[PDB]
Coordinates of C-alpha atoms in Angstrom, one line a residue:
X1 CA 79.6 133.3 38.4
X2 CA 81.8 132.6 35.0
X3 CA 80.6 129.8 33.4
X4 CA 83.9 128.9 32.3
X5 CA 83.8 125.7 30.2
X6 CA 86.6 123.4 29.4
X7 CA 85.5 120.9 27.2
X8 CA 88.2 118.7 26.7
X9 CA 86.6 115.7 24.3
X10 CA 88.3 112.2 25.2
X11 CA 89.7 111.4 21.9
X12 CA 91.2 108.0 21.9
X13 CA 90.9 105.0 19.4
X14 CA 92.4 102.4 18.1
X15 CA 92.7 104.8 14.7
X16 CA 96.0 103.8 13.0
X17 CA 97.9 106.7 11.1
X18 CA 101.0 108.6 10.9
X19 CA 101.3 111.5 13.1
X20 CA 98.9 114.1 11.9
X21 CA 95.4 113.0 13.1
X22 CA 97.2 110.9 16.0
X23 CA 100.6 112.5 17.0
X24 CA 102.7 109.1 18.1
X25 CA 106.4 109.2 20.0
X26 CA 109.1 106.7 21.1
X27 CA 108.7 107.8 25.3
X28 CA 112.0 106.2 26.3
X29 CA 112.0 106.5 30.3
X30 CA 115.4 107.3 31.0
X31 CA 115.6 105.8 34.8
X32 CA 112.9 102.9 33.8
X33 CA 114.2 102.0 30.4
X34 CA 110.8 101.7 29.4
X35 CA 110.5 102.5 25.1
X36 CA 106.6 102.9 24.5
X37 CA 105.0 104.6 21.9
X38 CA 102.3 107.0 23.6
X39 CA 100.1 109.6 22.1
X40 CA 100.9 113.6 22.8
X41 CA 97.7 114.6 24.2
X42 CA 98.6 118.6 24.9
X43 CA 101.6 120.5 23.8
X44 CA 101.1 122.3 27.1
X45 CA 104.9 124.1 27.7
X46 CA 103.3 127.3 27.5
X47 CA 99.4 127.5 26.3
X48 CA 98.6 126.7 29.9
X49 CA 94.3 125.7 29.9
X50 CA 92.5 124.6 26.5
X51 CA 91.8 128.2 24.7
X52 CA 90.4 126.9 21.7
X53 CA 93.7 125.7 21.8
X54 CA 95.5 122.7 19.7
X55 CA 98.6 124.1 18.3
X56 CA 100.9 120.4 17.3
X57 CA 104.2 122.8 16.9
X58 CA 106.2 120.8 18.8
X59 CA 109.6 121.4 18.9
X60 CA 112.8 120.0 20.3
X61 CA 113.1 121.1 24.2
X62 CA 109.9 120.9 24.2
X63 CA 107.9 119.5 27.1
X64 CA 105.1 117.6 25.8
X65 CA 102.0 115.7 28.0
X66 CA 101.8 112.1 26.3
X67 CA 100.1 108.7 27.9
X68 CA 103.2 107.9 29.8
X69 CA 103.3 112.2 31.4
X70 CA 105.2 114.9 30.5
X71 CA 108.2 114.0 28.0
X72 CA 111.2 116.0 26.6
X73 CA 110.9 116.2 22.6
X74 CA 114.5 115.0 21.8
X75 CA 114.3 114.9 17.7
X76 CA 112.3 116.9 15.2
X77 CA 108.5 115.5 14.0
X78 CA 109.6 114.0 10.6
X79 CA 113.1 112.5 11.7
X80 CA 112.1 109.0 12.2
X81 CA 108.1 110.1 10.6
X82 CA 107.5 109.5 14.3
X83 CA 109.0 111.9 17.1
X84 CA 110.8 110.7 20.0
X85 CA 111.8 112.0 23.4
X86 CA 112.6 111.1 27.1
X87 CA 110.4 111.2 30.1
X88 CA 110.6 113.8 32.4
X89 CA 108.9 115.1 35.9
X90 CA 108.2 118.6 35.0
X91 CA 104.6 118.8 35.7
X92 CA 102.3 116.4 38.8
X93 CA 105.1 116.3 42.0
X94 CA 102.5 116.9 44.6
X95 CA 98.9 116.8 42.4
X96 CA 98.8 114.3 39.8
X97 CA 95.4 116.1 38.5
X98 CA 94.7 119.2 36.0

């Protein structure tokens, strides 16, 4: 029936720049240990489903999707340039697709 389309374009380089074009953060796992810097992909806390959607207010308390999952935004963007965070299990328990 609805032809609903959700085109979400697989942007991902090797494009080096600060945090505008590419938004970086410090992913430190908190059980793990591991400290990676991964891309936010979505800022999908609330604006659930691309609706011409790609709103980069990201705020502390935030949960963010990044390379490594879903991550808690522990500083502001433009404390270390780069934002940091920990990861968290807030979205993909029993799916680990959307």
């Amino acid at each position: 029936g609805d032809r609903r389309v959700r085109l979400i374009r697989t942007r991902g380089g090797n494009t080096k720049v600060r945090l505008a074009s590419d938004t970086r953060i410090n992913v430190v796992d908190p059980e793990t240990g591991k400290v990676e810097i991964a891309e936010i992909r979505n800022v999908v806390e609330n604006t659930a489903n691309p609706h011409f959607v790609r709103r980069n207010i990201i705020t502390r308390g935030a949960v963010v999707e990044t390379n490594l999952g879903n991550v808690r935004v522990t500083s502001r963007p433009g404390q270390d340039g780069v934002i940091n965070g920990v990861l968290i299990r807030e979205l993909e328990h029993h799916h680990h697709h959307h």
